[PDB]
């Protein structure tokens, strides 16, 4: 890894941290409603340990 | 919109041993592995957890013994191979 490398990597990780992405804020805080309102309606309920 | 197919999921009847292959060496792990084969998952994947798994099969009897027949014809063929004859024809008697 050269230093020309190095940065390409650097930048690229970073571009990965820094774009925005809903899916944190859908598992937090809306992601539990739709399980468990699923969870009631199949035939087979939720088995969990 | 409602599927049911996507509702009312349940176990198939003979569930637990239907992909059994009829085979007498090694019923269980061949078993097993047609499971595993069965449901899509590639043996490059599954990796460690492909080799030392095993899972019912038709060809275990419930007392843990290979068969190769239903159990019944298997209690038909012993009671067969036992039949005395029920009248017999001798000079003495009477």
């Not at chain 1, 820094?18 to 088995?47: D, G, N, R, W």
């Not at chain 2, 269980?28 to 957890?49: F, M």
Request: hydrophobic content about 35%; charged content about 10%; some cysteine.
């Amino acid at each position: 890894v050269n230093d020309l490398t190095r940065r390409t990597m650097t930048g690229v990780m970073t571009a990965m941290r820094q774009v925005k992405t809903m899916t944190p804020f859908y598992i937090q805080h809306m992601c539990p409603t739709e399980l468990s309102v699923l969870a009631s309606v199949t035939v087979t309920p939720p088995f969990q340990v | 919109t409602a599927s049911p197919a996507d509702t009312n999921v349940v176990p198939a009847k003979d569930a637990p041993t239907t992909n059994s292959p009829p085979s007498t060496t090694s019923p269980n792990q061949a078993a097993a592995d047609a499971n595993q084969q069965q449901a899509g998952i590639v043996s490059s994947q599954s990796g460690p957890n492909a080799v030392g798994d095993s899972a019912p099969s038709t060809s275990v009897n419930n007392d843990g013994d290979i068969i190769t027949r239903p159990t019944s014809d298997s209690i038909a063929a012993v009671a067969n191979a036992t039949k005395p004859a029920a009248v017999v024809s001798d000079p003495q008697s009477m």
